[PDB]
Structure formats: structure tokens, C-alpha cells
Amino acid sequence: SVIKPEMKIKLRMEGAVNGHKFVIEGEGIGKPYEGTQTLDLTVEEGAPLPFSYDILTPAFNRAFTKYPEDIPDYFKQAFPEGYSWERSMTYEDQGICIATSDITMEGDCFFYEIRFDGTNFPPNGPVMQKKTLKWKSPTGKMYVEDGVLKGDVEMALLLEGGGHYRCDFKTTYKAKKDVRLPDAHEVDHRIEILSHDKDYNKVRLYEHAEARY
């Protein structure tokens, strides 16, 4: 198949949060059949970032997931053409974010085109006040609807002091060609920042994801 056991990743994120315009880029490498990946992100425009870097991470490719044989892999089939996704991320304190991504491929490398926008985050919130530690590891629910794939997942950010800052995720995935739609299933995730400089102008991101019934 066009999906090699080892693939390179190249991305560019353009967007804004509470009016703050920014541009990020990155490169990495992962094992699609393993469901693991690592990325090196650098803020090319608009640093330092006035808001918590964690909100951006789930925006930085379900092709990097480990799919059991008995579940059609919607993501791997969509290639070499590729697919795109749209997502709404509503936070409990009314902060909202919506993002899109267009994923293509060339040889042994993925290329994403990402747009990320957010607004109405309270100035004294855990987001604007950078009190975020990381994302709890959740189980997201995939299911088909309207001939397309949808994923719903209740996310939560761990706050300094011990609190939990909740956010509802809802994504719509769209293959660019017809493929074998799967049965409703779950996806276990683990997203983590392994290293970063002071103001997060350089970050090393890692994710481990496996699908299951």
C-alpha cells in the first residue's frame, strides 16, 4: 500500500486565538501501523504565544493509529488522495475553537494545511493564564453518519493546583475518494509534549493512538 511502515510529516498551522495572529510549522516522523508519531514545532510568526500551548496540540492525523484487522481503516484507505477534517472544540468556560486540516501525501511524506481559530477565552482563564499541564488520556467514539465519519470525545485539561478544565470535541472526517466505511468503534489516545523551550517557540510533540471495539 502507499502507506509505508515509516512516514515523514510536514505541516504549517495558520490562525488566531483571541485576535492574536500566529503561524507555526513543523516536521516529524511516525509509524502509521503502530499509531505513534513525533513532531517538531516552531513558532515562525507571532511569538511568544499569550495563551496555553495545549489547545493547539490535538490540531497537530488519524492515519497514525493502530487499527485491528477486524475494523476497516477509514484513514489508511483514503490514501494517496488524502482526506480533510473539520472540528469544533467547546470549552466549559465558553471559550470556543474550530479548526480544519487538509492532509495530502507525496512519496513517503504527509503534508497538512491547518487553520485554527478561537475566541471568547476569559482573560483570566486557564487558557490565557497558561495554567495548563496536559490532556487527560481519553477514549473517543467514532461512528458513521451522513456517509461520512464523525468522532466525538470529551476532553479535559489538567490545571495547575489539580483542577480539570473540560472541552467537547466533535470532528467530521472526509475522505477524498470512496472507501469502506467502518463500524462504530472507539479510539484510545495519549498526547504529550516531551520537550519545549521557555515560551514554547520550540516543542516536541508525541501521540500514541490505538483503535478498538
- DSSP summary character for residue 76: H
Give the Å distances, CA to CA, from 96 to 35, 139, 145. Answer: 28, 21, 24
- Whose grid coordinates read 480539570? 164
Instruction: Report d(CA 142, CA 80) in Å as an integer.
Output: 22
Taking phi first (over 0 means left), then psi (-120 to 50 degrees means alpha), and beta for anything else, what does residue 127 get? Answer: alpha
Instruction: Report d(CA 114, CA 98) in Å as an integer.
Output: 11
Under 8 Å between Cβ of 175 and 83: yes
Domain 1-213 carries which CATH code?
Answer: 2.40.155.10
Backbone angles phi, psi at 74, to 5 degrees: -50, -40
Instruction: Report d(CA 171, CA 43) in Å as an integer.
Output: 25
The H or E element containing residue 74 is: helix 74-77
- Residues 6 or more apart whose Cβ sits within 8 Å of residue 192: 134, 205, 206, 207
Q: Which three cell numbers stand for residue 16?
A: 488566531
Sign, CA dihedral 157-162-164-165, equals negative
The 8 Å CB, 24+ separation contacts for 11-15 are 11/39, 11/60, 11/111, 11/112, 11/113, 11/114, 12/112, 12/113, 12/114, 13/56, 13/59, 13/60, 13/114, 13/115, 13/116, 14/114, 14/115, 14/116, 15/99, 15/114, 15/115, 15/116, 15/117, 15/118
Q: Which three cell numbers stand for residue 170?
A: 466533535
- Whose grid coordinates read 461512528? 143
The residue ranges of every structural domain in the chain are 1-213
- Residues 6 or more apart whose Cβ sits within 8 Å of residue 85: 100, 101, 103, 171, 172, 173, 174
**Amino acid identity, position 137:** S
